From a paper:
The recombinant MacQ protein exhibited bifunctional acylase activity against various ranges of AHLs and against multiple β-lactam antibiotics, including penicillin G, ampicillin, and amoxicillin. The MacQ protein is comprised of 806 amino acid residues, including an N-terminal signal peptide, and belongs to the N-terminal nucleophile (Ntn) hydrolase superfamily. AHL-acylase is one of the enzymes capable of inactivating AHLs via hydrolysis of the amide bond of the acyl side-chain to produce homoserine lactone (HSL) and fatty acid. The MacQ structure clearly revealed a typical Ntn-hydrolase fold comprised of a four-layered α-β-β-α motif45 mainly composed of two polypeptide chains, α- and β-chains, generated by self-cleaving activity.
On the basis of the previous reports regarding CA, we created an SP-shortened MacQ by deleting seven residues from Val20SP to Val26SP (from Val203 to Val209). Unexpectedly, SDS-PAGE analysis showed that the purified SPΔ7 was uncleaved and was present as a single polypeptide chain with a subunit weight of approximately 80 kDa, suggesting that the seven-residue deletion of the SP inactivated the self-cleaving maturation, despite the fact that SPΔ7 possesses the catalytic serine (Ser1β in the cleaved form). Interestingly, SPΔ7 exhibited unambiguous degrading activity against almost all of the substrates tested for wild-type MacQ. We successfully determined the crystal structure of MacQ SPΔ7 in ligand-free form. However, each molecule was determined to be a homodimer composed of two uncleaved SPΔ7 polypeptides. The overall structure of SPΔ7 superimposed very well on that of the wild-type enzyme without its SP region. We could build the continuous atomic model for chain A, while several residues corresponding to the SP region of the wild-type enzyme were disordered for the chain B, and most of the residues of the SP region (residue 179–200) were disordered for chains C and D. The conformation of the SP region of the SPΔ7 (residue 183–202) was found to be completely different from that of the SP in the wild-type enzyme. The structure of SPΔ7 indicates a possible mechanism of the autoproteolytic cleavage between Gly202 and Ser203. In the SPΔ7 structure, the ~3.4 Å distance between the main-chain O of Gly202 and the main-chain amide of Val272 would be too distant to form a hydrogen bond. However, the pocket is insulated from the solvent because of the presence of the uncleaved polypeptide chain (residues Leu201-Ser203).
Residue numbers in the entry:
A (entry chain C): 8 to 179, 199 to 777
B (entry chain D): 12 to 178, 199 to 777
Amino acid sequence: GDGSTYSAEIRRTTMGVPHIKAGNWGSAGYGFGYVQAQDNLCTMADSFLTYRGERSRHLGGSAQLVYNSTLGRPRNIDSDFFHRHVISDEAVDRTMAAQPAKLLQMVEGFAAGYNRYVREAKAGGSAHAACRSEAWVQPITARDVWRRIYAANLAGGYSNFAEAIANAQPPQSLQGSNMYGFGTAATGEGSGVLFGNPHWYWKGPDRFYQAQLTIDGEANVSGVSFLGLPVIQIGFNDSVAWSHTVSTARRFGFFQLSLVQGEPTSYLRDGVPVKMKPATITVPSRNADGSVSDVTRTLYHSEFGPLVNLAGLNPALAWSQGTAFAIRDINGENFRTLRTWMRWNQAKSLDEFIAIQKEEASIPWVNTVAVGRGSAKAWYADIGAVPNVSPAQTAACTTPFGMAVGQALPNVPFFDGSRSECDWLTDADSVQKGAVGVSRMPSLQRDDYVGNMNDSYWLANVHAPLTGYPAIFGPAGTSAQTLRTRMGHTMALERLAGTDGYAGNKATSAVVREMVLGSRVFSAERFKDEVLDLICTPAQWTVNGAAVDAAQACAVLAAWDNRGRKDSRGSHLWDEFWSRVPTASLFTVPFSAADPLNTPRGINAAAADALRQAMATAIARVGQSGYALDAPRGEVLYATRGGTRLPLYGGCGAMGYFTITCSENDITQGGYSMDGQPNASNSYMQVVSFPASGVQAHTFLTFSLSDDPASPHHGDYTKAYSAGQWLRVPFTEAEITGNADYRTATVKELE
Amino acid sequence: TYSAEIRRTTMGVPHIKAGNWGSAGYGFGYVQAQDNLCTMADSFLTYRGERSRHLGGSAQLVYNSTLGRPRNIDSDFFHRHVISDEAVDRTMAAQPAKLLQMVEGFAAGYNRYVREAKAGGSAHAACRSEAWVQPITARDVWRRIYAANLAGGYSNFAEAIANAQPPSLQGSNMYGFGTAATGEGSGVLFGNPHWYWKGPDRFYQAQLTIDGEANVSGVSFLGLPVIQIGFNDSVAWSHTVSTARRFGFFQLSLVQGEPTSYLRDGVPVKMKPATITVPSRNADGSVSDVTRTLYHSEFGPLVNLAGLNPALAWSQGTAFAIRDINGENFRTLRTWMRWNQAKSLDEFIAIQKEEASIPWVNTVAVGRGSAKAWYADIGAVPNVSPAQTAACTTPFGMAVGQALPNVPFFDGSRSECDWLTDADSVQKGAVGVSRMPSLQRDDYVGNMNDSYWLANVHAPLTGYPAIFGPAGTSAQTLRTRMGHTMALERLAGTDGYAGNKATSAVVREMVLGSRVFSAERFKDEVLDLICTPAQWTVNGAAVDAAQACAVLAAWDNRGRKDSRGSHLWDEFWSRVPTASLFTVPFSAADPLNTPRGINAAAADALRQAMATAIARVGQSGYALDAPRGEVLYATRGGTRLPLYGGCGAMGYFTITCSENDITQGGYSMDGQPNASNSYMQVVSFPASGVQAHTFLTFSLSDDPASPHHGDYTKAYSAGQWLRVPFTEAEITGNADYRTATVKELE
């Protein structure tokens, strides 16, 4: 025995943020896995059942996943087949074989640290009372952590079709997030300013966990990871800061297979039979009466990827004697993402950040924006792993059956898998086979700003639109932007023009911290006045043959100033109204590429009757909820912690909020509670800059670090977010040890 | 001209007084809408198949009911296909004139309230200005009436019927106590349907007084115009769900190349097509048409059985149809009408046998002057013989028999497999009257949703057709074991209540007692097995069960408002793996006390289940020893009223069964609870005339603004039965009496 031991120093500061300090990558993984489990054991333990495909054994085949995530909530039995079949032992082998030694070590360490905590939770104590005595709270392996890492890569492709892939048998969605990078012409200062605002889960294993990793001599990085991931995915170090938003670029396509007659598990490749590769999978499943029964399916792969049951999309697309369909996710063969975040965690300049992004071409389903100490310009890119097809292919390769989806999935290549000419293409500068070459993926540097709110790359900067990149990246000058995108660029322009009501005309760290929470509602700012002019005089109506007294609703909305702040009165009536306004023929001024933030616009006077119908419904729904029409938003929109409803602000992107606090709960069922599993919402937030004293970051983790109701870090951060009080997260050693709430413990064990 | 006098008393209970059946229907339609417009209006979309047009084809039904909660588009197809214009015509053609009049009046009175809601007011604010609040026709009321009949057969397969293309009903207690049991001049009838707290199948309590014709009080589903469970001056009765199957399947042998024709003794028969178009609203607010062609066989509608088992797909060679006996039963509403007017128990029984129409429930009744109480599962039931079941069940039919025992699954290509008609069958293909179970007893009859076998445990019933359910071969539910136990212990005087007779006053207390059979019988053996020591290792984890052991030992096995720890027992018992739990098997000689005997081998599994129960309670925020009324509650006017009772699965008789997981704010009754205490009645016939005490647990009105949305619920929480006035003098002398007359030209 070589005596190797993991040893990590865990320093926790305010909100319980852990700052792991270790002499090597293994020990850093050991500390990070320990603190993730210490704060989120129940969410994590359940999640490892998902990636191993062991949910059904413990929790019953017919129950749904407990937590929402990039997988959604399929039945346990289908989730188990999906994971076993796509994240097979081969896919894990393949993934691990492409990894640098230091990351294989960090992941072994992470598993050991998770397991150390599991031993502590089994031993005793009051933490994680909700699950600590369950059989599925158990040690895991490094391989399990690689399953989880691989799983994260599939959000843009295979994950969205878990049930469809688990049920492909022979006859025998992703959305959200804002970010800005302001360059030094915008901040007026020696460095740019980075605003990171992923809209994401508040519960479940995809949710973020905030921490710092200090790996002596190699990295000192702070930010967030999904639970179960060992490197920082959105964050900063002494030299660079970055964030991500969902990209419009499709990451998957379909291949239609022409089957061998007599033999529906074989397909033709330029006239030659090729066998599909079978996998007979048995998933053990707990019966409602307590016993366990085996469930066996034989599922299949083609050379493109797994077989996929498309009959749910359209019954014509069943796997028949003549045709079957496969799905290819470009990320299924992309083993490079984890190393890419790793290299960014260690990056010493924006130029280096940029080179890593180009060399790896691995970013799986997101845009990236970054700012680097000493660099005048901010960076925007949708440089990652993306299917490569030419327009010639889209014309010659698309099949009749593909139409049946052509509205449901535009830009997704649905190709004739019979013809090798239809396989995805490889460029001279493609990093991976069948992926777009680096020079053909969009990016921009600007010394004013770049931003993205989940529209295409086109308007990274409104003054310098980007065009001429492959169609798969999304439209470039021909589609209207969403209301959130129009809100997000409007706020950026108004800041630099000094016309948004905040101090000065620079995107300083302090003013950015305020602006990003201001909760303006674009649909109300641009359209509420026209709507009221159109329907509020008279305010006594006939709607569906009923007398409707809209005088109070008209008054409340006229007095409301189009913001969803905690004290704003009537903002929820607007949400209930705007969300019901039929969209056909609503606007008289259509989209103009030369005016993309202010078009479409112009409420159609012919829409008057339908607007009164929608308003009358909205007044009824608010009355049914038991809230007053003029209730303050903080009473409607809230997070409960320690028995107290903490008031919140913000709203849904569909209303044209930029500040996102988007409840899944109907107003009539207790308001817009954030306590269940809300829609993608403000989660980890960071405002980062690089002033003379060193990197400075202000952060929130809105739902708080720990999922355990007994933890002091279950609702402390949430109370700060309710109050609008950004956390100045300590980063230097002196900042960490000088923090008012500093505590340090060391964990160690033999490797 | 319709004219009805509406007198309301305490809790808003309306007592409609009218000179004829049309006007009584007008008054009743008006009050039901006045209290429940939003539920009712939403329901008329359902029965007409017009949900998707207003609410989107993709959305599920808003309310639970006998239909369950399928997508709007499937519901709309089922209703249009099964409740066709022809089905409505046929239903109406079989009706007495006075009931056709009454349903015309009910439509007109509902429409009158619709006019008033549209004109102004703040009642029914939740929906008064929506397009789907709109006048209805008498035919629409008939659609609703027919729909209620299909609960035992078609309604359970609505989606499967809506998607049949070529290539769960449970609950309720009742007792009937005879004069030997009451020690008095009359029996005592206890009616306790466990039913919906929201949606159009929920009960609405009222009296109808129709000049020289009827004077009846009780409940109807919303949309129904006669009293379904109730009493009059001479007879009282109630219903519980019957175990008897009301449907079967016919496996069809398809005609070659013709997957919409089938063979009948070798001759092709064409299925009858219906091309149905349903407008459906899209997510952006436009409306687009959906079209399916669906089919009928001579047995009933084609049905998609691929979901039951993939092998049962409508293929080239085979298809499946479903026959619900109640699809051709047009008699049920006339049957309740005739009971509403009956002048004695003998007449009530004679009506039951004459009509043989009761569609999916048992009946128990007590009559004025009658020594013996009455139990029957006499109603409409498919008639197949043993010979025929052996000769006709197809190889597929045998496989499905395991999940669906006694549902005839027959070869529909053979005319000798058609359902039989006996000499005393009232309807073709239905069981004859002399072959359906009944019993009179001067002590008691009772049923809690097991079969007819133990209507009275001292005199079991045997030998009736298999279709009625098992009678000695299956263990009884814990609720049936608790319900009989309670009746025996009452008459033995060993239940703790006054005397040894089932008087109205004592029965009113006993039925709310909230005893928990699983705890009374098994908690001691559980704690003896697992509580010493109370420090455990469970899946390798140290578990401190000392508080759980102490709280359960101190709990007295009742779910009353003050009982501490009863919710920990719910979280535990519901988790106990049932395979091999009991060492004393079911015995037909001792059906109340078997199976029993907790298997010592289950100790690890019992610890696992208890550890998980402790965990779930901790996650909910409640203490292990919380009083039940804090955990189990109904919110009205912003106050959580404490409740008592529980779920049948634990062996409660007093049923208050939340669908809400305890970690989501406790056992709230505010959403759509599982079948629970709803209308309850304890009725007797003292020398002054019929006396009834009642609850409508969720209150009369679905409108949060109504003074009758929470008043009765506050009473139920307090355990204060309502003495419902019945005579003219009681009604006009009630402390809350108000009267108003509604009239209009016909």
